[PDB]
């Protein structure tokens, strides 16, 4: 068996600063632990996902590696479904090499950048598809509002909506991102939420006849502003509330007969092949695009993870652990 | 044409905060009971009036007009009709005036079954019954064995929701605002458990005590702090049919709801509805429920105030829980 040096990002203590994490260098024997069905992988890309905050205080353990979604190459497998040389995405450790237990998706199309399987072709892409295509029941010509529209999930939701023939507006936190939403992603309109004194008035300006669908990533005052601007039988897919303050306008659910429904992407993984079958031709035809931020090396991962909760990422924040 | 005095309940003023009796007054006018020339109007004699909580919304500046009669659902007898669909002597329910006699422009529903109390067509056989039916059967997607919580559970809508859920084999708990209403929930309506929300130190602890495995379905009539207590107690894929939020109707600023994050962790569907959208189901409802009423399988409690002069008191009393069951005003006999 190969025995190799293995750099790891370790949680130093419960929580978010760089100094709450630590780089540790250990040795690993690259062998499937005896009698298990484990998979030994070399990690290529690691995703920085907002939900990781919840686990830093199902939680992570101080002294142990951070874990998250990544893209990896299989080195050894005790599981029939995976063999040496396979590329996979799934939960893995923040380290060069991980032993992953049976409790993980094989990658088949290598014609797109591999980092995409942390975003558009990974969990965030599946989240956008589940939330918009399944939860929202969208129809051509409907009006759609996306909060956190320039993030990994939101940038896809808006494009999926444009593909269906919807009118799409997005909210973002800077000029650079607002311009991106319109220039790159093809949103009909977008606005900087930080500049608006009255979010309700802002949405009225962009939606003179109201919002059919709100893809909710934010919550709070933004939700209150959406509620008063919804159309009859409007739908709200509750994906995240990254801002998280009391919500005051829920009476609008009755007068407008709104369905507001939360979901978790892992309930929808049985639809992943269907999602891929839709989105991969669209990527290859340049009809759906994706923007990510890629940091080089594990020694960059502490910086990359912290920077996520102030919107220092543009699209999905990724860490490249290794080239291949 | 018959010429008669017509007492009316007038809205005096738009209302802020809680309504009081003095926000309304009784006026007497003379009118003639005649259909205006070439119109398709119906002249009726009002028999029963519903007091419904949504009327509070209409007291703000759709809304009522100060100086004019209050309007709402009632049961009436047709006296003259410019509409071929309605004949003298017909009994109807639908929107009418808070007065002895009204002129209507025909949905007015024609009542065919009078082997049930006519006052039932303000409640169980009228708009509240239909709300309970559509809200629970359609919006909640209920299944046998599920756990169900109903707020304002002894009221016109809630007392029916709990019975409908029991009939389906659900475990059903209700909250209400007095010992008398709690006893009624358990002894008359067949709720499995019920509690007085005013005597609970912590509503989320109270609900945890009644729903140790969580709540599959919340039929929401109250909003406010109750909704926040429910959210933290919902089961996975739980559903909330948002019917009303009466705890908010008299506030000049609503209370903030803080626990919506639970919609994500628990994958909850929270959906508002208006009974107005479900009237195509009213025949099905009436055909199901009337035989159940006549067979004593579904039961009802209404509170009948007597005379138009009692109507302001009956309406205002909804907001302090003075009604026991569906609040009705008997106009005539
Ligand atoms: N339900 C599920 O299964 C599921 C799955 C994956 C993700 N999620 C959730 O979906 C949401 C978006 O995920 P993502 O991966 O697309 O995140 P992302 O790439 O970070 O986009 C999130 C963005 O939200 C904006 N934001 C941050 N703080 C804000 C605030 N206080 N007020 C308004 N906007 C703020 C930022 O962009 P600006 O520059 O525009 O401020 C931030 O970059 C997150 O809440 C995440 O937890 C849910
Ligand atoms: N969506 C629709 O189409 C539709 C149609 C009809 C009715 N509704 C709504 O459904 C709800 C129930 O209507 P209903 O006709 O059955 O009324 P109801 O329950 O017969 O009477 C109203 C009851 O509200 C409770 N209440 C009043 N103030 C409260 C407060 N601050 N906190 C908690 N409870 C309070 C009281 O009972 P306690 O003594 O138990 O406090 C009072 O008896 C109302 O919100 C109504 O607006 C909706």
Q: Which residues pair with B28 in a beta bridge?
A: B7
Per the DSSP assignment, residues forming a β-bridge with A73 are: A42, A87
Q: Is B255 part of the contact surface with chain A (CB cutoff 8 Å)?
A: yes
- Has A105 been labeled as part of a binding site? no
Number of other residues whose CB lies within 10 A of the CB of residue B109: 17
Which of these, A172, A237, A193, lies nearest to A211 by C-alpha position?
A237
**Dihedral (CA of A302, A308, A310, A313) sign:** positive
CA dihedral B127, B304, B295, B129 (to 10 degrees): 10
CB B45 within 8 A of CB B75: no
Calculated CA dihedral for residues A292, A294, A298, A304, nearest 10 degrees = -60
3-state SS assignment for residue A28:
strand
Ordered DSSP codes for A107-171: ----SS-GGGGGTTTSHHHHHHHIIIIIIS---TT-EEEETTTTSTTHHHHHHHHHHHT-EEEEE
With an 8 Å Cβ cutoff, is B168 touching chain A? no
SS3 A182: helix
* A257/B272 Cβ within 8 A: yes
- Homologous superfamily (CATH) of B124-300 is NAD(P)-binding Rossmann-like Domain (3.40.50.720)
Distance in angstroms (rounded) separating the CA atoms of residues B254 and B245: 10
**Domain A1-119+291-324 fold:** Quinone Oxidoreductase; Chain A, domain 1 (3.90.180)
Cβ count within 10 A of residue A21: 24
C-alpha angle A114-A118-A119 in degrees, rounded to nearest 5: 105
The per-type count for chain B, helices as H runs and strands as E runs, is 8, 15
Beta carbons within 8 Å of A195's beta carbon, 6+ residues apart: none
The H or E element that residue B46 is part of is strand B42-50
Asked if residue A4 belongs to a known ligand binding site, the reply is no
Q: Strand pairing of A230-238 and A259-262?
A: parallel
Task: Yes or no: say if B20 and B255 are a contact pair by the CB < 8 Å rule.
Answer: no
What are the structural domain ranges in chain A? 1-119+291-324, 120-290
Query: What is the distance between the alpha carbons of residues B315 and B310, in angstroms, rounded to a whole number?
Result: 9
> Contacts of residue A263 in chain B, CB cutoff 8 Å?
264, 267
Q: Which CATH superfamily is domain B1-123+301-333 in?
A: Medium-chain alcohol dehydrogenases, catalytic domain (3.90.180.10)
Closest CA to A299 of A114, A24, A11, A13: A24
Q: How many CB atoms lie within 10 A of CB A73?
A: 18
- CB proximity B262 to A under 8 Å: yes
The tokens describing B312, both together, are: 């302001």
Interface test with A, best of B260, B265, B268 (most A CBs within 10 A): B260
Give me the residue label for tokens 């008997």. B330
B1-123+301-333 and B124-300 agree in CATH topology: no
Topology (CATH level 3) of domain A120-290: Rossmann fold (3.40.50)
Q: Nearest C-alpha of chain B: how many angstroms from A298? A: 30
Specify which residues B50 forms β-bridges with: B328
Long-range CB contacts for residues B305-309, cutoff 8 Å, separation at least 24 = B305/B329, B305/B330, B306/B330, B307/B331, B308/B7, B308/B8, B308/B9, B308/B26, B308/B98, B308/B99, B308/B100, B309/B7, B309/B26
Burial class (CB in 10 A: 0-12, 13-18, 19+), B297: exposed
Residues of chain B with Cβ-Cβ distance to A252 below 8 Å are 272
Can you read off the two tokens belonging to residue B28? 């007497």
User: Which among B245, B261, B277 has the least Cβ separation from residue A251?
Assistant: B245
The answer to the question of whether A69 is labelled as a binding residue is yes
Residue A73 structure tokens: 């190459």
**Residues within 8 A of A (CB atoms), B 178-237 only:** 223, 227
Q: Which residues contact B214 (CB under 8 A, 6 or more apart)?
A: B147, B233, B234, B235, B238
Q: Which of A245, A259, A263 sits opposite B271 (nearest CB)?
A: A259
**Shortest CA distance to B223 belongs to which of B187, B169, B194, B259?**
B259
- Collect all residues of chain B within an 8 Å Cβ-Cβ radius of residue A135: none
- Closest-approach residue (CA) in chain A for B262: A262
Decide: A199 and A147 in contact? Cβ < 8 Å: no
Q: How far is A224 from A177, CA to CA, in rounded Å? A: 23
| Residue B256 contacts A where some CB pair is shorter than 8 Å | yes
Q: What angle do CA B206, B209, B214 make, to 5 degrees?
A: 100
Burial of A282 (0-12, 13-18, 19+ CB in 10 A): middle
Token pair 């495995």 in the structure block, residue: B213
Alpha helix segments (H runs only) across A184-231: 199-206, 221-227
3-state secondary structure of A86: coil
Chain A partners within 8 Å of B265 (Cβ): 262, 264
d(CA A34, CA A99): 12
The single-letter DSSP state of residue A311 is T
Structure tokens at A221: 């005052």
CB within 8 Å of B44: residues ≥ 6 apart: B76, B77, B78, B79, B92, B96, B101, B102, B103, B104
DSSP B50-118: E--GGGGGGG------TTSB-EEEEEEEEEEESSTT--TT-EEEEEEESBSEEEE----EEP---SS-G
CA distance A217 to A222: 10
Closest Cβ opposite residue A261 in set B245, B261, B269: B269
- CA dist A175 and A198 (Å) reads 18
Yes or no, beta carbons of A264 and B268 under 8 Å apart: no
Q: What single DSSP character describes residue A54? A: G
């Amino acid at each position: 068996a190969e025995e190799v040096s293995n750099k790891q990002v370790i949680l130093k203590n419960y929580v978010p600063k760089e100094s709450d994490m630590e780089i540790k260098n250990v040795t690993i024997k690259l062998k499937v632990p005896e009698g298990s069905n484990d998979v030994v992988v070399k990690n290529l890309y690691l995703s920085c996902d907002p939900y990781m905050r919840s686990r830093m205080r199902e939680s992570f353990a101080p002294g142990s590696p951070i874990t998250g979604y990544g893209v990896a190459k299989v080195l050894e497998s005790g599981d029939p479904k995976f063999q040496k040389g396979d590329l996979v995405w799934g939960m893995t450790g923040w380290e060069e090499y991980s032993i992953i237990t049976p409790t993980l998706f094989k990658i088949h199309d290598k014609d797109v950048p591999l980092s995409y399987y942390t975003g558009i072709l990974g969990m965030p892409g599946m989240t956008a598809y589940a939330g918009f295509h399944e939860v929202c029941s969208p129809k051509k010509g409907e009006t759609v509002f996306v909060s956190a529209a320039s993030g990994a999930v939101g940038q896809l939701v808006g494009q999926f909506a444009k593909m269906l023939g919807c009118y799409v507006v997005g909210s973002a936190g800077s000029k650079e991102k607002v311009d991106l939403l319109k220039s790159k992603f093809g949103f009909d309109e977008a606005f900087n939420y930080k500049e608006e004194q009255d979010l309700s008035a802002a949405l009225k300006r962009y939606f003179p006849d109201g919002i059919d669908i709100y893809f909710e990533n934010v919550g709070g005052k933004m939700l209150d502003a959406v509620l008063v601007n919804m159309k009859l039988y409007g739908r709200i897919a509750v994906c995240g509330m990254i801002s998280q303050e009391g919500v005051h306008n829920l009476f609008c659910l009755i007068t407008k007969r709104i369905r507001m429904e939360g979901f978790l992407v892992f309930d929808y993984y049985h639809l992943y092949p269907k999602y891929l079958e839709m989105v991969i031709p669209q990527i290859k035809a340049g009809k759906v695009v994706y923007v990510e931020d890629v940091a080089h090396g594990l020694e960059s991962a502490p910086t990359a993870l912290v920077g996520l909760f102030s919107g220092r990422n543009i699209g999905k924040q990724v860490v490249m652990v290794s080239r291949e």
